[PDB]
């Protein structure tokens, strides 16, 4: 009857008063990120973000949230990608992600850029979002493997991709999950995420506590889709660690 909270398994949530029809519709609805603190507050229709302004969940009293707007004019809307359009605002960063990760040269030799944590956080922490264009498994599997570096399977029907030129931060920085390099001793995994802006995508989630400026890596693996040695090299070394 009063305030409804809808939690997703990823730890994010929708919160506000429902309308006469029991829908999350109004001007005082919020999406709350998995930190249970960073929030997008404002106009939602049936749970879908029309105009969310950056906010902080300051306190909750008997399930009733108290939000304060952040300074400035950061505004967001449900903006699900398509087969060809990655975003209506490719250069508008995600504010939760901006506080937790950054891109820099990978510490892995000859591995291009990598993703690094800004913060010390514990296990199972959502750090970053893997948004991209949505394409079929047929398109990915039927093309040259060298076009599939940024592909990540979403579900039975869809593969997410971050194709050129969006693989460059100067062209696309709305999410950064695609900047995480591979490792066989990763500190992170890809995981399902339901994002108020990007819709259903995947996220990067730590497997264990990480330190500030630690590089974030994920096991990509185990044969690449479509149609490398750096994989083969580390695979062997990883194997050796298991025996005399
Ligand atoms: C999903 S992107 C990761 C970000 C990428 N390094 C960049 O600069 O945009 C995957 C690509 O990064 C490189 N890469 C990822 N892991 C690597 C590794 N362990 N060693 C060498 N290169 C790696 C490969 O070129 C791969 O195609
Ligand atoms: C985030 N995504 C990156 C690409 C990826 C690959 C891949 C694609 C092209 C070239 C190399 C790789 C490396 C490992 C891999 C292994 C198994 C399935 C997919 C992948 C899966 C994870």
From Swiss-Prot:
Changing residue 105 to A: Increases near-attack conformations. It comes from the Eukaryota. Its main location: nucleus. The keyword Repeat applies. Its EC number is 2.1.1.364. Disulfide bonds: none annotated. Residues 99-221 form the SET domain. It catalyses: L-lysyl(4)-[histone H3] + S-adenosyl-L-methionine = N(6)-methyl-L-lysyl(4)-[histone H3] + S-adenosyl-L-homocysteine + H(+); L-lysyl-[protein] + S-adenosyl-L-methionine = N(6)-methyl-L-lysyl-[protein] + S-adenosyl-L-homocysteine + H(+). Changing residue 113 to A: Increases near-attack conformations. GO terms for biological process: chromatin organization; DNA damage response; heterochromatin organization; peptidyl-lysine dimethylation; peptidyl-lysine monomethylation; positive regulation of DNA-templated transcription; regulation of DNA repair; response to ethanol. Belongs to the class V-like SAM-binding methyltransferase superfamily. Histone-lysine methyltransferase family. SET7 subfamily. This is Histone-lysine N-methyltransferase SETD7. It comes from Homo sapiens. The lineage of its organism: Eukaryota, Metazoa, Chordata, Craniata, Vertebrata. The chain holds residues 116 to 366 of 366 of the full protein.
């Amino acid at each position: 009857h009063g305030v409804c909270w809808i939690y997703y398994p990823d730890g994010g949530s929708l919160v506000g008063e429902v309308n006469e029809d029991g829908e999350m519709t109004g001007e005082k609805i919020a999406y709350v990120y998995p930190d249970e603190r960073t929030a997008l507050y404002g106009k939602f229709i049936d749970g879908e973000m029309i105009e969310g302004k950056l906010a902080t969940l300051m306190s909750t009293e008997e399930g009733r949230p108290h939000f304060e707007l952040m300074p400035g004019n950061s505004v967001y809307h449900f903006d699900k990608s398509t087969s060809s359009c990655i975003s209506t605002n490719a250069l508008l960063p995600d504010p939760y992600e901006s506080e937790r990760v950054y891109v820099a040269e990978s510490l892995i030799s000859s591995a291009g850029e990598g993703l690094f944590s800004k913060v010390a956080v514990g296990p199972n922490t959502v750090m970053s979002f893997y948004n991209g264009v949505r394409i079929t498994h047929q398109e990915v599997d039927s093309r040259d493997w060298a076009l599939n570096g940024n592909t990540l399977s979403l579900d039975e029907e869809t593969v997410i991709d971050v194709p050129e030129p969006y693989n460059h931060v100067s062209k696309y920085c709305a999410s950064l999950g695609h900047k995480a390099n591979h490792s066989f001793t990763p500190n992170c995994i890809y995981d399902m995420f339901v994002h108020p802006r990007f819709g259903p995508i995947k996220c990067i989630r730590t497997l264990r506590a990480v330190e500030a400026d630690e590089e974030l890596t994920v096991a990509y693996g185990x044969x690449x889709x479509x149609x490398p040695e750096w994989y083969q090299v580390e695979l062997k070394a990883f194997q050796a660690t298991q025996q005399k």
